[model samples]
Target: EITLPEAKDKLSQQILELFETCQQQASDLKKKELCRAQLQREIQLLFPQSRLFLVGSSLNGFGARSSAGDLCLVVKTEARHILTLVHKHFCTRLSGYIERPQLIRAKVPIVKFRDKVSCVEFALNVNNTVGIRNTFLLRTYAYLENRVRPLVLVIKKWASHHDINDASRGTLSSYSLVLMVLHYLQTLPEPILPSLQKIYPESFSTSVQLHLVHHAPCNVPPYLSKNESSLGDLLLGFLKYYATEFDWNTQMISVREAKAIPRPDDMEWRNKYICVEEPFDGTNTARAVHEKQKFDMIKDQFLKSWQRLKNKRDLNSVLPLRAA
Candidate 1:
């Protein structure tokens, strides 16, 4: 119903409104800190040396108000055993403080539970050094520019509403979606972000300990990107880029590289339809997007959304808040 130029401005305004509404508030942060401190006190009774580090969306700065807290427990013990003990302790001792304590015995064992007092869901894993490292990496990206956070939040919300954001459901994970946004920005003619790993390989090295790197300041000198695209322009461009330009079959999305790379020939990488390289471990973050039907569904959403946004220039047409 609106002209393209008018819609662009309106879309940008809508994005700002959504960002303000969805971003973590001061009280939200206070609750998380309180939860972490309380959890640390309770878990220390089991393992005296245990330390908890807030990771993932909560600490990464890209978290929404409803985002769950991800904690990495540092202790000198087997992860599964430690998680099991913590699970038992939480269920038996802290029954009123927490609920729905489930220990997920996956490749990376974790205890998932909800803090009743704070009304915050938490997933705790032990010694997930890579996860901790990636959390900081994402935090760095989230803070790099004014637009990065807003664009990521808007796209994440859009993807979530469209049912294309859940990794466990065979769609892109939130992390993969963030990387896609970064990749789009990096490949633009006037790049918004330089590959931090490429710029400072020494800082991103896997050899660095979590504690040592956690507070390490970003040494990359101040960068002012020449790309002055508005949030609406960036969002439209992002959808168009992925929908029309990106070759999902033969190309792999790599945030560490300035350009999309040729898909690897290895069996592991070869099998996945949408390959996204995890910046630290070089693993495919989009491995959960396995089924051909799911990939097609994802692509269809992008194409259809892009089409709706382009023609109608109405964000709600593609991302309806009421339906969500």
Candidate 2:
């Protein structure tokens, strides 16, 4: 039996409806492209000078349009500033958590309700460490010889067609997505996050883990089998089962808000479509198809460069300037 994660009552109902409605409005592939483009717009408006990237499932092609958009936000300022935005602009139902953002990162907030995990968490990167957006680094990840990359599009399609939402408090495809990512980072020849930062320069932030290569990737590989396991076994032995093994209840932030969203055993807040109007300054007319084609071509080329990273490892070396 495919061990699908158990969804919380609300997430199960709401997220399933979202998937069904979006699939009817547009195909999954278009939904991915269009929606991410929209997310890019959302971030730029939120932090005009900052940038963000689709790092996890969304980038690899395994994200649902109506699902929680996984992202990495980067900025020139400090981590505390980012927290302030979450605290001030983003309404917080509980002052206890917002009053001490650092505590959220350190303690990794968990407030269990009726013996069920009922909390959302967030963290900040207090240090300014530059990482990947480099040609060599991304290629290293893309071309790793034995790594079994997910056919993200296929997996996402399967999940959507099957109406797989977050496994309530259980593992869903997205929850599995975070786990697989942790798995990939653990097996990498080099530390994954910094190298990836060099590749997707938009993702750098200071408040994240300093031992990020290890902490960010190798957190916990999930206990699916009675015996312990690694990423390879998880992928080959049980793809769907491998999906829900990791516990996402451990993430720093479970939802967009600092305080947890209202959850009813039979309700899903995120799944209910909220018609958030685009801010006036944020709106942009659809670009010409030719312009879109150009960006899309660049995106593909970036991936090719990303895949060929190992061949260019030495290329990361720089030349010293000649004495004047």
Candidate 3:
């Protein structure tokens, strides 16, 4: 565990400061939303039929997790159409190479898009509604109560117990616990999802099983590594059991070449992000506190949260992920 820095740790403050600056320098979220809408409108206007949606860090609150600008471009089109239109934004020469993590398209830029944003940034998919399935599945685990929730709660509680809430900290919540829960579920043998599909019709769309079984994080920084951070492969049967029952094909994009982020002409691209300022109103929330006050609060919370965690785990019996 990282030694808890000084009460007012300079490094943590700097990282947070950088986070704010990066936010400001990036494109306006509202305008980016509009631009995305316009792009889709144009796609339809020109081709008369197309589908797209925001499907990156912009959609997920985890945009702060990545170190790059957040953007995702998905065009559901025939092979010929995709080849022709991908470069209109370039306007220059379409000399960019293909970047396929998936085998289908060679020149597309799926990988690069994955790594940008704050964290797990995927947009609200358009046209091809399969992402509805994808997002819903993601949401299930995100909430405090789904199949993976118990494990996530355990890891997060462990992190807080150890006073390691910083995502940059090499801790449990900072690691791959979330993905581990999802990946482990893919190993389920009984296939409870098929029953779920029957009950909640249209839940698992195209290649439902394949997507769960085979996923990749190669476009950006290597998203996944060996199961080094616990939640061991012994727990992997859930993945095999369930994924086999409700199979879907793996369909990741290859945006490794989309290094050129499309900054809107109307917006000023700051080298940093928006300052998550202190609340103008006098409140004790994260953004409301003054620096010194915030520091005190963080220390207090960390200590209390940490103590509660140890109590829950070591003294009280089986650590309950949730209160009864």
Candidate 4:
């Protein structure tokens, strides 16, 4: 039998290998760029003033090999009418290239479709500037530490395999998962990440347009984290944190504030089982996790995975490789 420290080292190597296999390669990213350019050209034909910005995981450094493309369409005016027209155009004129185009007329309308050639799923929303800002906010955190991406990617994989990562079916969203990781790192004994929003509030301000605020420069002098924990140790700590330490009942995860704050007493946030505040907007990101059964299952997964890792010290023991 190996010692716990030795086991951790082995597990860390396994996580590194998984990251390399799961991460987006340069060729995959180039394909996404080409797909985006084609979609932009198609969009511009209808509304000449409209512009498409690649947002979410595709732009953020945390993207996985199979992650979907999130596009935000910025237009000069009449977003409501434009979305209606765009949806019709996608159904008729653009039907050959775009498959199964769906327009979800929510509070903020969005168009969801797949590119026929690339098989890349895309969700397009109009004037949702907050999403662009949130993407950059996450991108900044991703660049802050070397360990951040690996740890997050591993957790995301674990969450996806265990069936707790889908927000559409009343579970946690990917954004919420990322925020939890950031909060864990920030609140660590020797913090691994700083609150970027707190440090540079102007950059995250909602008033700024997409062109006004540039993507956070990766080449800027890095924020050196004092925490020296290995990838395996951090991953185990992350699972242990949400399982045993975080107060799902009362405390809310806040990356913008860089700490767990008291859950708000307001009607919208008060009833949430997992309260993860949206960094830019004050709404709860985990509001979709409303059902008690789903919440219990998520918590139980964390508890079981943490215990299994602590005992077995094997990532595959808890997160078995899924067939691609």
lDDT of each residue in 168-232, candidate 3, tens digit only: 23222222333333433332342211122223333333454433411211111111122222122
Poorest stretch of ten by lDDT in candidate 1: 1-10
Error of 4 at 81 (Å): 4.0
Question: What TM-score goes with each of the models?
Answer: 0.93, 0.28, 0.32, 0.93
* Model 4 global lDDT (CA atoms, 0 to 1): 0.84
Model 1 global lDDT (CA atoms, 0 to 1): 0.84
RMSD of each: 3.9, 22.3, 20.1, 3.9
Query: Residue 263, candidate 3: how far off, in angstroms?
Result: 44
Candidate lDDT values, in order: 0.84, 0.31, 0.31, 0.84
Residue range 189-278, candidate 1, lDDT tens digits: 998988888887787788887787775336545456898788888999999999999999999999987579999888888888998998
Q: Model 3, poorest ten-residue lDDT window?
A: 251-260
lDDT of 2 at 27: 51
Quality of model 2 by C-alpha lDDT: 0.31
Query: What TM value does model 3 have?
Result: 0.32
